[PDB]
Design an enzyme around this catalytic site. Structure first.
Site, mmCIF file in Angstrom:
data_model
loop_
_atom_site.group_PDB
_atom_site.id
_atom_site.type_symbol
_atom_site.label_atom_id
_atom_site.label_comp_id
_atom_site.label_asym_id
_atom_site.label_seq_id
_atom_site.Cartn_x
_atom_site.Cartn_y
_atom_site.Cartn_z
ATOM 1 N N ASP A 53 0.802 -1.200 0.000
ATOM 2 C CA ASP A 53 0.000 0.000 0.000
ATOM 3 C C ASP A 53 0.866 1.295 0.000
ATOM 4 O O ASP A 53 0.387 2.305 -0.518
ATOM 5 C CB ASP A 53 -1.071 -0.038 1.040
ATOM 6 C CG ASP A 53 -2.299 -0.808 0.576
ATOM 7 O OD1 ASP A 53 -2.707 -0.638 -0.578
ATOM 8 O OD2 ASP A 53 -2.886 -1.560 1.366
ATOM 9 N N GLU A 88 -5.758 3.659 -1.518
ATOM 10 C CA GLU A 88 -4.576 2.930 -1.001
ATOM 11 C C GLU A 88 -3.959 3.686 0.157
ATOM 12 O O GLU A 88 -3.437 3.070 1.073
ATOM 13 C CB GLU A 88 -3.542 2.685 -2.084
ATOM 14 C CG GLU A 88 -4.061 2.103 -3.380
ATOM 15 C CD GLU A 88 -4.344 0.572 -3.299
ATOM 16 O OE1 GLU A 88 -4.994 0.116 -2.340
ATOM 17 O OE2 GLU A 88 -3.954 -0.148 -4.243
ATOM 18 N N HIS A 90 -5.713 2.714 3.171
ATOM 19 C CA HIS A 90 -5.203 1.415 3.635
ATOM 20 C C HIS A 90 -3.963 1.666 4.473
ATOM 21 O O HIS A 90 -3.861 1.150 5.561
ATOM 22 C CB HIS A 90 -4.844 0.509 2.449
ATOM 23 C CG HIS A 90 -6.030 0.205 1.608
ATOM 24 N ND1 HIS A 90 -5.946 -0.472 0.412
ATOM 25 C CD2 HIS A 90 -7.334 0.505 1.803
ATOM 26 C CE1 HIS A 90 -7.166 -0.558 -0.103
ATOM 27 N NE2 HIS A 90 -8.026 0.013 0.725
ATOM 28 N N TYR A 105 -3.036 0.620 8.531
ATOM 29 C CA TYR A 105 -1.919 -0.148 9.109
ATOM 30 C C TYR A 105 -1.315 0.605 10.267
ATOM 31 O O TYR A 105 -0.981 -0.007 11.274
ATOM 32 C CB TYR A 105 -0.834 -0.523 8.124
ATOM 33 C CG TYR A 105 -1.426 -1.211 6.914
ATOM 34 C CD1 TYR A 105 -2.396 -2.240 7.054
ATOM 35 C CD2 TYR A 105 -1.012 -0.871 5.643
ATOM 36 C CE1 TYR A 105 -2.925 -2.901 5.922
ATOM 37 C CE2 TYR A 105 -1.536 -1.510 4.538
ATOM 38 C CZ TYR A 105 -2.488 -2.529 4.668
ATOM 39 O OH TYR A 105 -2.993 -3.117 3.516
ATOM 40 N N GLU A 113 -2.242 -6.626 -7.431
ATOM 41 C CA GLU A 113 -3.611 -6.506 -6.942
ATOM 42 C C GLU A 113 -4.308 -7.862 -6.896
ATOM 43 O O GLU A 113 -5.099 -8.133 -6.007
ATOM 44 C CB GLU A 113 -4.462 -5.610 -7.861
ATOM 45 C CG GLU A 113 -4.017 -4.144 -8.010
ATOM 46 C CD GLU A 113 -4.324 -3.315 -6.766
ATOM 47 O OE1 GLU A 113 -5.077 -3.797 -5.899
ATOM 48 O OE2 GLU A 113 -3.810 -2.198 -6.609
ATOM 49 N N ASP A 139 -11.876 -3.036 -1.398
ATOM 50 C CA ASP A 139 -11.307 -2.015 -2.296
ATOM 51 C C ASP A 139 -10.399 -2.654 -3.326
ATOM 52 O O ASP A 139 -10.447 -2.330 -4.501
ATOM 53 C CB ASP A 139 -10.449 -1.043 -1.462
ATOM 54 C CG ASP A 139 -11.281 -0.123 -0.562
ATOM 55 O OD1 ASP A 139 -12.494 0.046 -0.845
ATOM 56 O OD2 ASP A 139 -10.737 0.420 0.440
ATOM 57 N N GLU A 140 -9.541 -3.579 -2.881
ATOM 58 C CA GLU A 140 -8.641 -4.275 -3.808
ATOM 59 C C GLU A 140 -9.386 -4.966 -4.939
ATOM 60 O O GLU A 140 -8.910 -5.023 -6.061
ATOM 61 C CB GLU A 140 -7.603 -5.201 -3.145
ATOM 62 C CG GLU A 140 -6.842 -4.625 -1.941
ATOM 63 C CD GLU A 140 -6.068 -3.326 -2.199
ATOM 64 O OE1 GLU A 140 -5.888 -2.921 -3.346
ATOM 65 O OE2 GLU A 140 -5.593 -2.686 -1.249
ATOM 66 N N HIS A 145 -9.869 -2.440 -7.472
ATOM 67 C CA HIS A 145 -8.636 -2.121 -8.165
ATOM 68 C C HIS A 145 -8.281 -3.144 -9.196
ATOM 69 O O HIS A 145 -7.829 -2.859 -10.292
ATOM 70 C CB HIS A 145 -7.466 -1.994 -7.165
ATOM 71 C CG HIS A 145 -7.797 -1.047 -6.061
ATOM 72 N ND1 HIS A 145 -7.091 -0.954 -4.887
ATOM 73 C CD2 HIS A 145 -8.836 -0.184 -5.960
ATOM 74 C CE1 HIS A 145 -7.661 -0.045 -4.120
ATOM 75 N NE2 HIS A 145 -8.713 0.449 -4.755
HETATM 76 FE FE LIG Z 1 -5.256 -1.795 -4.594
HETATM 77 FE FE LIG Z 2 -4.519 -1.338 -0.812
#
Ligand SMILES: [Fe+2]
Ligand SMILES: [Fe+2]
Ligand SMILES: [Fe+2]
Ligand SMILES: [Fe+2]
Ligand SMILES: [Hg+2]
Ligand SMILES: [Hg+2]
Ligand SMILES: [Hg+2]
Ligand SMILES: [Hg+2]
Ligand SMILES: [Hg+2]
Ligand SMILES: [Hg+2]
Ligand SMILES: [Hg+2]
Ligand SMILES: [Hg+2]
Ligand SMILES: [Hg+2]
Ligand SMILES: [Hg+2]
Lengths: 340, 341
Positions: free
Chosen positions: B84, B115, B118, B122, B204, B237-238, B241
């Site tokens: 990310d 991203e 994301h 973390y 991805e 979300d991924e 993508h």
């Molecule tokens: Fe992504």
């Molecule tokens: Fe991500």
């Protein structure tokens, strides 16, 4: 020499905001400048979606509008579209490759992303009030008046971009490219960055606010209240944007970040001054295109012009520049109602 | 040659996705490929706030875990953080200067923005399970295991950015720079873009899914449930993508958007296959190390390696590449409870 993931383990707290080692890890647990983290949080907290906003009645209001009023409204909206069109891509293309601290890197990405939402909102407004939007949208690129009022913005960016590429490709020095000498001076790129930022601060702090005044003029007359609710939301965002550019500017000049950047801010102070003057003048000249078939009973080139000097003085002082205009009180304080 | 506002009045509906006239007006009232507008709208509807997830009980869970398990968890979180970190900035730096249609430009920006959320998540997790996050963050950059598993992602992006710079500055041709010849070929730049997109598609498509399996392995056991909720939002979300990169590659190789690009893709097919396979391989090699000092409860090198083969095959087929492994059904069907997509 640019890398999407620099392999050196570097202490990000000690990098300069710009021109340091490119950011590798995106962490938000510590910040060299907490102001950027705070802006990211505020901006995310303000997330909104245009389509949520009801502009149903704005179609009626607009249709009822006298042609010169429609012309004013639209011209203003086209300018807004232009500015957020550029501000949606520019900060990412021009700044990301130069940033060296994660908090500023993400701020820029959040800031730019928020500009795309503004762009999306104009599309939402336009399609809800006109019959074919292609008319409005196709009239932005070629509208001489628009390009006249917007002149110079794409220029700071594009030159900053060109030099940054040579700097990444060739590194500092004088080089021979196809038989031509090309000089890559880092001091100079820092100066182009400093100038682009100031130009962007003017765009965020003055160009938009002027457009807001027109938008709100209608609102005070109880017309186009959908557009106005959107504009208020947009305005709430640009306020964060300008807080960010003023900070970047002020931190660079304080010499607390890159010391060479503070000497540069110094050397180029007249240039900074000049661009704001030039921006403020371009906005005045716009007044003459806006009021072509006429003005309104609450707005004319005069009030416009005064508000512009008004706001320009406020902004230039926020970044330590001398005031070019005569001091005055807000020529339109009702606007402070919506502004917030 | 790159401009933040191309002055030519152009029909955005007929520009190629890449390498045409830089986008000037950002409008969403019309599109050449509506998948990109659809993607923007779903991503905006999926907006979530990391800090909104309670991760307060993950601290004792992590503390209570066996050392082989803390290691697996943390190593996996470090890799997610790395992916990310790269994806928050790269699509912007790498693609924005080459995009010629507005919906795609705005998708790329929206994609990258998501991203960064994301990444922020973390830090939320990390701050809540360790006493000093620096211990974790200061180990990603140089962690041997992580650079190995992530190996080559940055290089594809960096070489594309480099060639793009030369293309924008010097234009196509054979030129000279400091006593050396520098050839600039659009066809070669087009190939670097295809390979880089193929590479991001694998990232991805598989790199994140392997990591999801590990995290969700802990959630199946009722552990690190705060982290799980975050990972579940990240996985949603991924999925968008990946849909995006798939459509970009399929539009490119098909010839519908850029005929020369189609020709180029056909000619680098084996190269595309190899890199996809090399990515799968790295994920396996990771899982090999990961489970050597002891294997987690419910997941081990073996099941994990099968899962990699299983998704890899599905992902490779989706963008027209030959299946590299043996056809099998999903080895960890329980993963589906966590992958809402
Ligand atoms: Fe992504
Ligand atoms: Fe991500
Ligand atoms: Fe904006
Ligand atoms: Fe802004
Ligand atoms: Hg700038
Ligand atoms: Hg600029
Ligand atoms: Hg107005
Ligand atoms: Hg105005
Ligand atoms: Hg200056
Ligand atoms: Hg200055
Ligand atoms: Hg790539
Ligand atoms: Hg790429
Ligand atoms: Hg695991
Ligand atoms: Hg290929």
């Amino acid at each position: 020499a640019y890398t999407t993931f620099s392999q050196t383990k570097n202490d990000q707290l000690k990098e300069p905001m710009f021109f340091g080692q490119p950011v590798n890890v995106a962490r938000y647990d510590q910040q060299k400048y907490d102001i950027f983290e705070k802006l990211i949080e505020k901006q995310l907290s303000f997330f909104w979606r245009p389509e949520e906003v009801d502009v149903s009645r704005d179609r009626i209001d607009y249709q009822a509008l006298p042609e010169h009023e429609k012309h004013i409204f639209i011209s203003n909206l086209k300018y807004q579209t232009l500015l957020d069109s550029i501000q949606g891509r520019s900060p990412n293309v021009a700044l990301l490759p130069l940033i060296s601290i994660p908090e500023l890197e993400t701020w820029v990405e959040t800031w730019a992303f928020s500009e795309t939402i503004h762009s999306r909102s104009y599309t939402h407004i336009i399609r809800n009030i006109v019959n074919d939007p292609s008319v409005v949208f196709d009239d932005i690129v070629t509208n001489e008046q628009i390009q006249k009022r917007a002149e110079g913005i794409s220029s700071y960016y594009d030159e900053l971009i060109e030099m940054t590429s040579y700097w990444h490709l060739l590194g500092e020095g004088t080089h021979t490219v196809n038989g031509k000498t090309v000089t890559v001076s880092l001091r100079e790129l820092k100066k182009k960055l400093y100038l682009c930022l100031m130009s962007v601060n003017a765009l965020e702090a003055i160009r938009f606010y002027v457009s807001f005044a027109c938008s709100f003029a209608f609102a005070e007359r109880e017309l186009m209240e959908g557009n106005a609710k959107i504009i208020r939301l947009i305005a709430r965002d640009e306020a964060l944007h300008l807080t960010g550019t003023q900070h970047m500017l002020n931190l660079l000049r304080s010499g607390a970040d890159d010391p060479e950047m503070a000497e540069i801010a110094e050397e180029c102070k007249q240039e900074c001054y000049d661009l704001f003057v030039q921006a403020a003048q371009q906005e005045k000249d716009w007044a003459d295109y806006l009021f072509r078939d006429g003005s309104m009973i609450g707005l004319n080139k005069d009030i416009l012009c005064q508000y512009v000097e008004y706001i320009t003085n406020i902004r230039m002082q926020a970044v330590g520049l001398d005031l070019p205009f005569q001091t005055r009180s807000n020529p339109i304080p009702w606007i402070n109602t919506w502004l917030v």
